[PDB]
Write a protein that binds this ligand. Sequence first.
Ligand code: SF4
Ligand SMILES: [Zn+2]
Ligand SMILES: [Zn+2]
Ligand SMILES: [Zn+2]
Ligand SMILES: [Zn+2]
Lengths: 356, 32, 752
Amino acid sequence: ASLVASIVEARKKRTAKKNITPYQRGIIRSLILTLDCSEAMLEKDLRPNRHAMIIQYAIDFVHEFFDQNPISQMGIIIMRNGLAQLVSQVSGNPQDHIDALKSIRKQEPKGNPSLQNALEMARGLLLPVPAHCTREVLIVFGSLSTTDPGDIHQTIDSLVSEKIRVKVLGLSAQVAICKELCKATNYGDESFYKILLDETHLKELFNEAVTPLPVNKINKGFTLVKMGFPTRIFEDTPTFCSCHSKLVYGGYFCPNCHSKVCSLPTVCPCCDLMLILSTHLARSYHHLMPLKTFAEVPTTEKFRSEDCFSCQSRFPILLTSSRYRCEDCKQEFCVDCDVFIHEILHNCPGCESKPV
Amino acid sequence: NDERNELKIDDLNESYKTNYAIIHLKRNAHEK
Amino acid sequence: MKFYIDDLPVLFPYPKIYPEQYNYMCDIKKTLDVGGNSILEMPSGTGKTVSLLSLTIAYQMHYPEHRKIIYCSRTMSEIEKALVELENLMDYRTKELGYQEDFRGLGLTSRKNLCLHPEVSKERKGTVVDEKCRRMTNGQAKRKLEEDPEANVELCEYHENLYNIEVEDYLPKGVFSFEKLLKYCEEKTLCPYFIVRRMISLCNIIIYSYHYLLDPKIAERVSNEVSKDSIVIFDEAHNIDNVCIESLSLDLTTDALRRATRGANALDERISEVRKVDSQKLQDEYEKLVQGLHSADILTDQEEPFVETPVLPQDLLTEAIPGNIRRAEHFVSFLKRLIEYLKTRMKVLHVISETPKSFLQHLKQLTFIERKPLRFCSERLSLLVRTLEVTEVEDFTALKDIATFATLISTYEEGFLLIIEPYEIENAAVPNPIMRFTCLDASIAIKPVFERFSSVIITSGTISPLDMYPRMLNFKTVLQKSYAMTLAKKSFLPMIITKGSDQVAISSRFEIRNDPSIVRNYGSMLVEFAKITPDGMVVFFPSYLYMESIVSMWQTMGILDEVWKHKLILVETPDAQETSLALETYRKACSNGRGAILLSVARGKVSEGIDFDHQYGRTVLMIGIPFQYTESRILKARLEFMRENYRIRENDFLSFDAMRHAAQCLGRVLRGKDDYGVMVLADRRFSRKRSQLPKWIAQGLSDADLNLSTDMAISNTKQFLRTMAQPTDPKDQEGVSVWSYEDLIKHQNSRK
Ligand code: SF4
Ligand SMILES: [Zn+2]
Ligand SMILES: [Zn+2]
Ligand SMILES: [Zn+2]
Ligand SMILES: [Zn+2]
């Protein structure tokens, strides 16, 4: 039963994974990461303290966010002494934000938190953002109280008017205003206010925010965005970069004004045209054609082959059949491959091999 | 108006339903 | 939904339903169909008002009898909530049946709550409001204006505009809450008070407070209009005995008698003045008095007696006026020497408790006042005032107290006691004698109700133990039961704190209120809970004086300074309006995330109808068991009376009284099953009262939480609050705690 207990839990874990529909997701994002640095963040419930762990996971989130959302941008704000302090402008450079977070890691948190000040600052940072982007604010909250100079309800109404979306990660318990902010802003959904229960669950919560948010059916901002695919040049003598005005050896040439840029993806400093590589778009294709989940095969029927289709690992004999099949191609897969086929790879090897 | 909403029992009402839009990506294009 | 009981179709205004609500409705219908009384105790986290209205309204609309409904709450604020629920239920019925059925539902309250006159609604007390409205609506102004238009007496446009239209057309069909009623009447310049009072005989459901059913002063007029076969619901009747006792009680002070002699002298002067110029009025009244008429036959339906009938209508003598007080001057002399006897009885030097018979005997000895004339004192005074044209009655107001005392002490002799104390406040430089006429039996005022009406439902969230209410109030029930909420995941954490973090015992005993250790131990608990409570935190104290002393002590200690950093401090004050403003501020701070803490009294105004659910309440801090002041003559007399008559031990009743208030405050924190909060009972004496708590609260109180420390309660609270913030699994509550229509049908199939 103990081994069966593992099986049934595995089936229950798979139950959630069974439902996968090709939701429309906003690939081009514009995130504002708000961190809480107040007296309440000096506690020791998270080792060594709340401030240290939050900053560390923020750096990891920055790495993951820009890895899977290459054509997005991020800005970082913190709450200190009842004021909102800006530490990073909206930009597509993942290194600027990590450097800012590392600097923040030293100073001791103190004072009171102010959601209204942070929300107002985030509202202003997302003003010069195109209409095709998804304006999002991810607040990491640790306090149980808010000291604001004005009416927070008016700010919430303004946020809803500007089509900004708020996700809040609380530390100890539910705050009434945070629930309202995450609900009135997400079209009534109450799943965007998450309260962790341990260190491990926090890492999952940060990891979940990396993926793009599905869009609402009545919020239509469909448009064609003018992009550019520059050609990398290899030069013999250094040349000035049009973005930082410093000598670098080689850089991509924009096809609209021929000015060179150090790194991609960025908006060209001259023609204001986004420069990206084809790979940066290919990094998001798995969010538009998600691979349909694999369902275990009951032992009543007869199996096809003794070994895995893609990895040639013989299935153990053991109660519970250790086989998962792809309905599209009907090829059995080992339990190990299916995790790697749906998290690292995003194409079923069986489907590709089949000719049409 | 406002008082009525507070007196109502929210837990006994229908659960919130998501209204997310789906996209079906057809795949067909000319060769290079 | 729309489901079926044995033959009654009932339309619930929600698509889902709790198992408790369905069982509650089934039991109510069983009681209604079988006849008799019942005592039902449903938890507070389950919708009770909606279930009651849903079933009862359906019951009245389906059966041929079409029995009416009387809904009794304990405060005016509850009438609004009931009316709002009624409006929501009826709107659902109007949308599912395809038409608005013939239905009228109105609330009822005093003029002060419903006066639209720009100059009479600006008063700070309801007695003055009644006087001014009576001056403009008695008919004296109208008759004088009819005879001579030049008269300067004014009227109320609201009252006058009603005479143009018929009583059946005062309001459109439907349910009218006070908020809606005032808005409608303002747009048409009508009096909501007179519209309601003139439509009680036409309402399918009438909602008023207990004071309009038990207090004989304001009950008789309202009672004569309701039907005899109506359904009677006693909502939140866990403290109904207190209402029943204050209805037949009175207090006299030295200032009252000193103000009564002036009024009697003024009345004699007025009689002399009227005798000189206009004497036919006196003879006309005397002639009718000789015939045998009373206030009912002399007074028009438009006018009201000056002295409200202080006794139950069944105990009023039906014989003619005795003759001693038949003339104006003789009655005044009768009244004056009665006042003198009361004054000479206020000079005692020790507490004297006597029966009404002994007081009457001594009165008949020192003076020569007999029992029978004393019974007509209130009835006669109203006639004398009515015939004297007393346009301003400020002088005669004090006489209403003497008349009320006279008609009470001469009517009842069993279950009543007269206490005379030389010290109303023992902590006073100069004695201030007081005379209290107290009612010991709580069933005297409720006896007419349980006999007039066939079916009565006594329901409340914390009415336990259920056996004591039939004992205390002499009535019998067909069924008495309490439901246990089938909550999938525990939603409320009830804990008992017996000592502080230093393990020193904590208690709210009044004799040790000024103790540096207990004061600091309670303050530390207040601060620590204020640190982990997310939004709202209500703190209840055994008495207002205890709260005043301890809060002042905390200020010196500096404990309040620590609380101010995390939450705003709102305090209950003797003034009602200021406390209402405090409630408004406390709710506002809870909503916007600022966080607030509300310090109130367990037996105060906040605890008798204000609910702190969701964010308005996430933790309840019961600072001590809310015991009464034991060294009270009234309470000791009542305890002795109950012990001899109903065989209730004094300690048992005192504990029952204290727990019925502690539980009362605990249940005001849950509205639905998605609501959660922590209930902490901070007293070493609470540890043995778990069996005395309501069943649904006791079941949630674990054996490890019976005697906790402050630190151990904080750690559990932190874990519980963290656990309640997680997304609940729908399947865990899909069909065990919340029912769809399909689930309900299944439950009807397996049971049958
Ligand atoms: S009739 Fe109504 S509005 Fe006019 S004074 Fe009396 S209570 Fe007030
Ligand atoms: Zn550069
Ligand atoms: Zn360019
Ligand atoms: Zn494999
Ligand atoms: Zn496949």
